[PDB]
Amino acid sequence: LVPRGSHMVGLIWAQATSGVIGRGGDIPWRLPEDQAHFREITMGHTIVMGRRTWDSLPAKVRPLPGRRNVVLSRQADFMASGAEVVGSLEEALTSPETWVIGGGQVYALALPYATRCEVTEVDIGLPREAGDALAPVLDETWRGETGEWRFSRSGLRYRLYSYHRS
Ligand SMILES: NC(=O)c1ccc[n+]([C@@H]2O[C@H](COP(=O)([O-])OP(=O)(O)OC[C@H]3O[C@@H](n4cnc5c(N)ncnc54)[C@H](OP(=O)(O)O)[C@@H]3O)[C@@H](O)[C@H]2O)c1
Numbered sequence: 001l002v003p004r005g006s007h008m009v010g011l012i013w014a015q016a017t018s019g020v021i022g023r024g025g026d027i028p029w030r031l032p033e034d035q036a037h038f039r040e041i042t043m044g045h046t047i048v049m050g051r052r053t054w055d056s057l058p059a060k061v062r063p064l065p066g067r068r069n070v071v072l073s074r075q076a077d078f079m080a081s082g083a084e085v086v087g088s089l090e091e092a093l094t095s096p097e098t099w100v101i102g103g104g105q106v107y108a109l110a111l112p113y114a115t116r117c118e119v120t121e122v123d124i125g126l127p128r129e130a131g132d133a134l135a136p137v138l139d140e141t142w143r144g145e146t147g148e149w150r151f152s153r154s155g156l157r158y159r160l161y162s163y164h165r166s
C-alpha cells in the first residue's frame with residue numbers, strides 16, 4: 001500500500017529486447033496489450049514525462065486522460081496545454097504515487113528516486129541505432145520478476161517484468 005504522506009516513484013516503459021524504447025520521435029512498434037497494461041498501471045495517478053515524450057503524443061490525445069500530466073522541460077517558454085510544465089524532478093514528484101512514463105532521458109534522471117519499475121518487453125528484433133532512446137539499465141540493487149513469454153493478438157511475443165527495491 002502507498003501511505004498518503006509518502007512519495008512513491010515508479011517507472012513504466014516498453015522496450016524491444018535490445019533495450020530500444022524510442023526512435024525518430026515515436027515508439028517503433030505498436031502493441032495493444034502494452035497500451036492496455038500502461039493504462040491499468042497509471043490510471044488515477046500523476047504521470048511525469050519528458051518534453052520530447054509530450055511532443056510525441058498527438059495533440060488530440062494529450063494530456064492523457066484520467067491522470068495528472070506533468071511535463072519536464074528546461075525551456076522557460078515551453079508550454080503544454082492541459083498539463084503542468086516543471087523544470088525539475090523535485091517539482092514533478094509531489095504526489096503520493098507518481099509514474100514516470102518516459103522517455104530515455106527522464107527515466108535515467110528519475111531512477112535514483114524510484115522503487116518500482118514495470119516493464120513490457122516486446123520480442124521484436126530492433127537493434128540499437130544512433131539517436132535511439134533506450135531503457136534505463138538496472139543495477140544489482142533491483143530485484144525483478146520476469147513473466148513468461150506471452151503472445152499478442154498482433155503476432156508479437158511479449159513479456160512483463162516487475163522490478164523493486166527499497
Ligand atoms: N517505449 C516507451 O515506453 C516510451 C515511453 C515514452 C517515450 N518513448 C519514446 O522515447 C523518445 C523520447 O525520449 P527522449 O529520451 O528523447 O526524451 P524525453 O526523456 O521524453 O524528454 C527529454 C526532454 O526532457 C527535458 N528534461 C530532461 N532532463 C531534464 C531535467 N533534468 N530537468 C528538466 N527537464 C529535463 C528536456 O526538455 P527541454 O529540451 O524542453 O529542456 C529534454 O529535452 C521518443 O521516441 C518517444 O516516443 C518511449
Ligand SMILES: CCc1nc(N)nc(N)c1OCCCOc1ncccc1CCCO
Pocket residue numbers: 012013014026027034035037038053056057061064100101102119120
Ligand atoms: C503505451 C506506450 C507505453 N507503454 C508503456 N508500457 N510504458 C510507457 N511509458 C509507454 O509510453 C507512454 C507515453 C507514450 O505513449 C505513446 N507513445 C506512442 C504511441 C502511443 C502512446 C500511448 C499514449 C497515446 O495514446
Ligand SMILES: [Cl-]
Pocket residue numbers: 038039064
Ligand atoms: Cl494512455
